[PDB]
Design a protein around this ligand. Sequence first.
Ligand code: SF4
Lengths: 191, 106, 140, 175, 312
Amino acid sequence: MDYTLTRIPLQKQEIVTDPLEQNVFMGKLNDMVNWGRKNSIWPYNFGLSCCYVEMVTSASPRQADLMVVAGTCFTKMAPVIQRLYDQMLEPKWVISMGACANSGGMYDIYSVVQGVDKFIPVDVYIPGCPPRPEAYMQALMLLQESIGKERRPLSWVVGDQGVYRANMQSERERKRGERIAVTNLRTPDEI
Amino acid sequence: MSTSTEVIAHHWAFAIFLIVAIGLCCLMLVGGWFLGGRARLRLSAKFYLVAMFFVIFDVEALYLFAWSTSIRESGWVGFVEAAIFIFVLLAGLVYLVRIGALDWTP
Amino acid sequence: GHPNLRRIMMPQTWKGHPLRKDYPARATEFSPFELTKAKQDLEMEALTFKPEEWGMKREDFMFLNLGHGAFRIVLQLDGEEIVDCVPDIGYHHRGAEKMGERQSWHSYIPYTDRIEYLGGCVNEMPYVLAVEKLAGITVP
Amino acid sequence: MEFAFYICGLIAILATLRVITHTNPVHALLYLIISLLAISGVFFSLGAYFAGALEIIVYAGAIMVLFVFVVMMLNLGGSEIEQERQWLKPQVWIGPAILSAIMLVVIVYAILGVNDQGIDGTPISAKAVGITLFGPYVLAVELASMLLLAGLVVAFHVGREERAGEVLSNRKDDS
Amino acid sequence: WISPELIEILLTILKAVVILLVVVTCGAFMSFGERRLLGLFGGSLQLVADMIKMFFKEDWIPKFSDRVIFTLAPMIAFTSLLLAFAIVPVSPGWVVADLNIGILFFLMMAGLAVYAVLFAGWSSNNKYSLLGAMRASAQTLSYEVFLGLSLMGVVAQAGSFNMTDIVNSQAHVWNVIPQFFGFITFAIAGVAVCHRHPFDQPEAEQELADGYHIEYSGMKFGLFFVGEYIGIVTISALMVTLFFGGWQGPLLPPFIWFALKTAFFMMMFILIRASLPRPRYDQVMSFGWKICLPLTLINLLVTAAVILWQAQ
Ligand code: SF4
């Protein structure tokens, strides 16, 4: 599969192939780096209104290399979100909980930013008013797969200084067979 | 000494242990820095009080450090002088308790 | 005759009045330039702090912003002991009333759930009862 | 083990020289800590094991701790003196250094000419220091205990706040 | 250029590197076990994965701070309690420091350990972290003031500082049963100096104070973590070799016995972590002065009296 390269929201992205198909020691060492980043993921759960309390039932910044934006994107708190995003250190990943972080999410009104997609890049989205903790966990597995298939610069001195994000197959196309092949459901008149 | 061919081995092991622990920490910090890729007021006086308690009782402790090695070479007169040393030490300690310097009370 | 009469739900750099009928109840285009102005303002909030707009008394007194929900509360310090405080609110403003002027009588029920998330159904009770009072409905 | 003594003495001289002519006091205290470490290495090189042990246990473990406590406590950064840089000027630095160099020259003239058997091995264990310290020096340890008690009493009497809280402003004369 | 003396000294060097690597590995294994047997109230490769992540992260140096002491505080927190382990014997012929001052060196390392917290508080340009480092340093001073006396109990019972002399004076009875007060005071002092769980986050009782562990990222915070864990495992090793039988056992090999007793102390530390809740700051100070220091002074007096009573 093919990747997008980001190199030094308004920047340009181009869709190229991975540089590992062009050395054999670099291939396994990059695999070990991606494995280490995938297995040990430290989250920074941002404290917002009513998705943050939902994932409570499921640390300080700059040691957590991952931000989970939970609640509604208020215009007063959006600079706080971006500032806390630039606090964290590369590599960093973003998981959006709820419709309010993906989009405006039932609030298309003056005081709500239409998602954090307007100002920070998001790696994984989760749809819907408050998602279950199992949905957050499955998003963690999906992002672990995305991190495990990546090509980041191993050092800032020697090597290609560009980040390669993989074009994953979308979950609606992958799970299309098991979703369309659903015949019957339980009636809502029982428990 | 540098001639007993076993304690000199222990000295070499001790020095190499120190320098290779320092080198391991330095190389760990070097690996952290190199690899990864880039992108008025005043505290109190109670802290001073407890640190002064630490240093004063630490010197009054180093006296017992020296005493504890020669505790059997010295006789009962050494026990008597160490007993009155510990007695005046505990008198100062209970003075600090009863006055109130030793409590925090937030 | 009102002390420190200022905006409490919206920031001070807000032009219009939201609950007025001529104010459009839609999210406008998100310009990053305005967000960078607000980020720079947040960077110099403690540097250019003027305790006269907040309704504060102007050497012990130290002014700090102390960041259930999350909200800032400014604090005036005599050492550790605290003498004045104006809790800065409006950081969680969703415009429930202005959307109440937008949604119908039936589509506003989730918005009545989302004002207090721990209550929920308790919070959609009063809207439903007032709507039934408007419609003249006596429920069984 | 004389090479270790020479290296420790040289880096102790250099460390205290950087202590004297530094701007902010935290790095000065760090250089004094490594100077005390070098002095302890000198102590170990001369068979005074208990002396170097007490040097890093107490002198580099309690005194510098107290200095760092005060520095980080009243939030001094060397300010309002470090903008002057008065000790990096000839009219302040030339005079007293010349006077102290004259003192050094006459005292090392006094050092030379003395007979020298030389430093030998046979390190002085802490057991012998314990025997002597609680032998002919009973009054030494009792009156040093009273000395430490007196120092504790004085610095408690002087360096107590009598106010409340773990944060206090630098109010003039404490109201 | 092969000579038997060169072979012996190179074998001693190899033994020193082996014991260093095994104590670092066992500290990391303590970290992995503290992750494992806390959740119940192979998986070991997550440790290597976490190390790989912390190696392959962008470092931070704060633009208002100074580099040298900010990067030197994790050096202190790691290596001070690392070289505190050099004095501990694991076998009749597997020690790396047979010096005369056998436990005073640990006292030097424990005295130098507070400079890591102090330098972290000063270098981290944050007044809340500075206040938290002040509180933590005050705690570890007030609880390390009696560490020396709790160890002088064992030294007075044995008669010398050297660890071989301790483990040879424990040849008939282990030191835990004549000096249990010294044992509990040394355990509490070792927990508090190491900044373990009951004496952890002293900034929790205040909101103008934050932890000194903040403003570090990546390998510096990782160094703080592994330095705390080598400190707790060398405190376990010191406790067993000073109160239990150092490498002493009926049938199993001496190094196997020492490792088993050290891990036994590690599981005891996990248990006391799981059991005792966090006290607040005021009883921590009140206990660590009022109950801890007179008790170890009285313990020293009583052990002096009993070793001078049976003086033959
Ligand atoms: S998606 Fe629902 S639960 Fe989550 S922040 Fe929005 S309104 Fe709250």
